[PDB]
Amino acid sequence: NNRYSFIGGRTGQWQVVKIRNVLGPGLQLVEKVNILNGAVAEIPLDSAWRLQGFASNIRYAIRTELEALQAVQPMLNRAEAILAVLIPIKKSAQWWEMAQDERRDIFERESHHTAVGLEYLPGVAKRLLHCRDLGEEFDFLTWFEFAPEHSSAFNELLLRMRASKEWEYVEREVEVWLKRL
Amino acid sequence: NNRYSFIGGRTGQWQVVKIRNVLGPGLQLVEKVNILNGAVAEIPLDSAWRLQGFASNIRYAIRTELEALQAVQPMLNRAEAILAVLIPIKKSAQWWEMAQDERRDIFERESHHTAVGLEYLPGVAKRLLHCRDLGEEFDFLTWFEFAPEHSSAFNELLLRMRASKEWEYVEREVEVWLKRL
Numbered sequence: 031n032n033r034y035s036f037i038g039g040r041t042g043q044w045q046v047v048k049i050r051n052v053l054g055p056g057l058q059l060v061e062k063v064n065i066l067n068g069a070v071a072e073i074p075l076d077s078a079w080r081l082q083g084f085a086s087n088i089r090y091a092i093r094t095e096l097e098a099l100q101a102v103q104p105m106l107n108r109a110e111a112i113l114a115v116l117i118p119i120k121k122s123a124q125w126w127e128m129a130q131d132e133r134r135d136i137f138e139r140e141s142h143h144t145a146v147g148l149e150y151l152p153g154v155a156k157r158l159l160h161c162r163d164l165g166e167e168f169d170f171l172t173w174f175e176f177a178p179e180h181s182s183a184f185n186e187l188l189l190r191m192r193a194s195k196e197w198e199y200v201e202r203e204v205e206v207w208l209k210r211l
Numbered sequence: 212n213n214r215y216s217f218i219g220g221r222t223g224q225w226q227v228v229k230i231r232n233v234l235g236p237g238l239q240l241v242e243k244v245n246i247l248n249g250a251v252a253e254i255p256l257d258s259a260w261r262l263q264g265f266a267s268n269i270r271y272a273i274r275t276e277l278e279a280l281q282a283v284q285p286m287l288n289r290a291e292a293i294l295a296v297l298i299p300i301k302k303s304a305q306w307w308e309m310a311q312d313e314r315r316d317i318f319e320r321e322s323h324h325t326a327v328g329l330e331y332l333p334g335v336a337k338r339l340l341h342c343r344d345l346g347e348e349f350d351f352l353t354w355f356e357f358a359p360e361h362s363s364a365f366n367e368l369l370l371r372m373r374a375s376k377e378w379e380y381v382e383r384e385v386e387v388w389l390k391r392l
């Protein structure tokens with residue numbers, strides 16, 4: 031199954047280190063994040079929030095870009111990658127009104143998202159989930175995993191992305207730093 | 212809400228004229244199709260199947276094509292559009308493994324999906340729903356509406372699409388012809 035849930039509450043595989051409400055309404059601080067694949071009948075109500083999103087096909091990356099990405103992309107679930115960051119993202123209506131060529135021009139031709147991200151592989155593992163189509167308050171759920179030696183590089187990557195043209199359209203963003211249990 | 216459900220059963224707004232099982236397993240023949248804006252978990256006891264999908268953002272149209280479609284696309288529920296066709300589609304895994312430039316090259320440079328379809332606007336209203344990401348048996352639900360005069364034109368359009376390179380990646384297809392009640 032391609033559906034994933036992120037439950038903010040008192041159980042989970044990850045301990046919340048901090049939450050940084052970068053832009054827009056934030057997320058209440060909780061003790062742990064519970065990650066679930068597929069639907070489960072019971073998710074605690076004593077939980078604070080529940081995000082979700084699905085893995086999907088490629089939307090912008092071209093073939094040569096994939097080849098370069100799959101050649102340095104690390105796997106999730108590395109013993110050393112005891113730190114994780116969940117960054118839900120929402121883009122503005124203005125971004126979604128645009129055609130495919132206009133969004134590709136902004137995503138890569140101007141902002142070089144993928145060329146910038148490749149500099150931080152294989153130290154940082156990154157997965158993408160889509161959730162605009164589910165009516166979720168966010169449009170994406172980005173997931174990052176890496177060893178603590180890469181914390182400075184990752185914090186540098188965040189600031190690079192936020193200074194790009196593509197992030198002029200982001201109107202809601204939160205950082206949920208996690209430590210593995 | 213951007214979710215739509217198509218209940219094949221004994222109730223609904225549309226009367227099933229015929230179902231043609233074009234490619235792969237088909238859909239049981241029913242009396243009517245009931246269309247609901249929203250998801251439907253439990254399905255009426257008198258129903259035979261349920262299809263669902265969501266309206267989403269553009270995945271392939273460049274802005275020159277989008278402005279042409281939007282200036283010509285007709286509404287839904289035209290007084291004369293008493294015929295409707297529901298065509299669920301499923302593409303192969305080889306298609307979903309490809310990158311965005313590869314899939315776009317086939318979708319337009321080789322098949323001319325948008326250039327071909329535009330010839331049959333404004334006669335035929337056309338709406339696209341996505342459902343691969345929900346885990347449905349189909350990848351897309353396509354919805355058409357037209358007056359009986361444009362029924363032959365629609366059938367020619369179908370011939371053209373099915374002879375394109377894009378349709379060599381299709382592995383399941385069914386036609387559910389409908390009449391407005």
Ligand code: HEM
Pocket residue numbers: 087088089090091099117119143144146147148150151154156158170172187188191
């Ligand atoms: C090593 C670091 C990174 C790499 C290799 C990378 C690569 C990519 C690639 C190739 C895509 C396109 C996916 C597709 O075509 O469907 C993408 C999408 C995306 N990335 Fe990243 N990225 C990185 C860092 C980040 C960071 C730090 C964030 C947020 C802070 C982020 C947020 C997003 C979002 C929101 C999308 C969805 C774009 C859209 O559909 O509008 N990425 N990324």
Ligand code: HEM
Pocket residue numbers: 130268269270271272280298300324325327328329330331332335337339351353368369372
């Ligand atoms: C007037 C006739 C038609 C027009 C104007 C038209 C237009 C379009 C456009 C512009 C797209 C791209 C949407 C996007 O970029 O997200 C598309 C996709 C699609 N069309 Fe058509 N089309 C027509 C006829 C048909 C027919 C007859 C079928 C099936 C028998 C069909 C099946 C599909 C499918 C399955 C997709 C999704 C392709 C994908 O995402 O890989 N279309 N159509």
